[PDB]
Amino acid sequence: MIQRTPKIQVYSRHPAENGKSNFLNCYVSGFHPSDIEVDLLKNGERIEKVEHSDLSFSKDWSFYLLYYTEFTPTEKDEYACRVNHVTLSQPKIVKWDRDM
Amino acid sequence: MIQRTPKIQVYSRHPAENGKSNFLNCYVSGFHPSDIEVDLLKNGERIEKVEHSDLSFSKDWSFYLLYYTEFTPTEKDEYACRVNHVTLSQPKIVKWDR
């Protein structure tokens, strides 16, 4: 068994302009078990017409690597990152894209 | 067993200025197993002086919820989100910050 307490973020879709319709969000992430009760409140009181409610499940068991160093870009010099891993058919080279 | 293909992101720390000193990053994420070879290249050639390689492991098995609706913020109204979950002592209320 596992249990994980949710993190809770409350934010609006856009920056709030008083009187301008907007969407209010509660992002509740990383909770287990899935049993839960979530409400948005106005002046302490439950808002009952909440239109959207998107639930997903995520699992992970994986590694992360940040690999970096000082450099000085120029016009002609091309940079890239090359990775080799058993899940690849061959080494993968991803070029650096300045000004995506 | 489990096996997962890395995602690879290559980016500069700051916006690149020619002759202006910077940091080139390669972020290789979400791979399993851990066995790996990663190199930064310059014009196809391996850069040997790489000063930083930070490795971490992450596990997850959890749920994610976006709960939202259309509203109109006005001057005097306070909004919050209230959640109850077995991992909490009591309902947790989080105020809308701005």
Side-chain angles (χ1 to χ4, degrees), chain A residues 1-6 8-12 14-16 18-22 24-50 52-97 100, chain B residues 1-16 18-19 21-50 52-69 71-77 79-98:
Chain A
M1 75 80 55
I2 116 87
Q3 69 197 19
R4 255 279 271 283
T5 124
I8 305 169
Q9 305 168 247
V10 190
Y11 64 92
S12 42
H14 322 110
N18 232 70
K20 190 77 249 71
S21 140
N22 203 147
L24 217 205
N25 306 83
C26 189
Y27 181 44
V28 11
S29 42
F31 62 94
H32 198 268
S34 49
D35 310 71
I36 202 162
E37 178 169 17
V38 180
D39 291 294
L40 292 164
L41 310 175
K42 181 211 266 221
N43 304 324
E45 302 196 16
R46 185 167 166 237
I47 297 164
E48 322 192 305
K49 61 108 217 291
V50 173
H52 302 242
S53 181
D54 308 335
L55 180 84
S56 62
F57 173 74
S58 188
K59 59 162 149 61
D60 199 6
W61 186 274
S62 79
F63 287 83
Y64 298 71
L65 198 262
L66 186 58
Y67 189 61
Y68 59 113
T69 200
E70 181 265 358
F71 83 129
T72 305
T74 179
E75 278 168 334
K76 76 165 172 181
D77 288 341
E78 275 200 0
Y79 291 86
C81 182
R82 176 184 62 210
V83 176
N84 203 19
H85 191 259
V86 287
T87 59
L88 296 172
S89 43
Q90 55 214 108
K92 162 148 276 269
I93 302 181
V94 178
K95 213 164 81 74
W96 174 53
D97 255 34
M100 266 276 282
Chain B
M1 66 81 67
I2 169 153
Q3 171 176 293
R4 246 280 258 290
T5 305
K7 183 189 202 90
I8 295 84
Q9 301 172 89
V10 191
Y11 59 101
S12 202
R13 185 115 97 184
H14 319 295
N18 275 237
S21 185
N22 211 334
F23 286 72
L24 182 66
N25 309 75
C26 183
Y27 178 45
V28 180
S29 57
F31 60 95
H32 195 266
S34 49
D35 308 66
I36 202 150
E37 174 169 41
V38 173
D39 281 298
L40 293 171
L41 314 173
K42 185 210 161 236
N43 301 320
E45 295 214 319
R46 188 217 249 173
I47 299 156
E48 298 184 333
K49 72 147 217 331
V50 173
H52 291 278
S53 97
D54 306 332
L55 187 76
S56 63
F57 174 71
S58 199
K59 63 185 192 305
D60 200 0
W61 186 276
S62 78
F63 287 83
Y64 294 79
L65 181 66
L66 189 53
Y67 185 64
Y68 61 109
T69 196
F71 81 131
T72 298
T74 58
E75 194 182 39
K76 62 224 184 93
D77 294 322
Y79 292 90
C81 176
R82 182 182 52 208
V83 10
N84 202 198
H85 194 258
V86 291
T87 59
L88 300 172
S89 334
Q90 51 203 117
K92 179 148 57 163
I93 293 176
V94 178
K95 299 188 227 187
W96 178 38
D97 173 27
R98 286 217 344 120

